[PDB]
Amino acid sequence: MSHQKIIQDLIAWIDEHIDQPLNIDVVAKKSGYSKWYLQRMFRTVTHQTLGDYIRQRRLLLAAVELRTTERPIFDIAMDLGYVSQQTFSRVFRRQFDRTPSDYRHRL
């Protein structure tokens, strides 16, 4: 089994469990590998990062929880690896170039 089949399984590993507290100590242990070694092979298969991409699906989930659900900004961050919305609102100007308040207005 080549490693390009490993990371193909890893793209369906998280697509249901980004609302869960999913950390690297779960992803590495339930893959059969170590904590660091999964990140070296992750570059040569999809050209992007791993610890930011789980945020990139988490910040994708916050936008589809804002354009559909009435949940506030402060405690969507509580389930997605943040302890407050102060940093969680800040990276959204990097990921989608918008404010977490301004997305729901422009339809």
Added chain:
Amino acid sequence: HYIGDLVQRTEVELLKTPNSLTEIKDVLASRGLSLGMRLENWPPA
């Protein structure tokens, strides 16, 4: 309408009404409660 309904409607449910997130955490910790409980067979009325 209920105090026990307010614990079902967690802290990711209340804040978008116009016109307290830290004050409710003070008023629960004074009298021994918590926010975000999951209840069952409620309300029985």
Added chain:
Amino acid sequence: ATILAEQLEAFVDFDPILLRPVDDLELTVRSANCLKAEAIHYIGDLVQRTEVELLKTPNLGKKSLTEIKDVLASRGLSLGMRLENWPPASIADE
């Protein structure tokens, strides 16, 4: 009162999706793509293996306990239950 009560004793009077691949069983995302990597490419091999090591492999997590047991609750299948004839001649992988 036993002397008295002994005087009154004469006066008191085939399933279609069991033969299905796991990835086309209409489940959630990480409930189906983790069975085929442990020689379970059918539904018949999942019901006949011990659960105290199957979820403890480094491919399956904690949230998969429900949906495997969701199939196992309705039709009447048991944990580690043997079957009469699940496997046909056609077996494959991805």
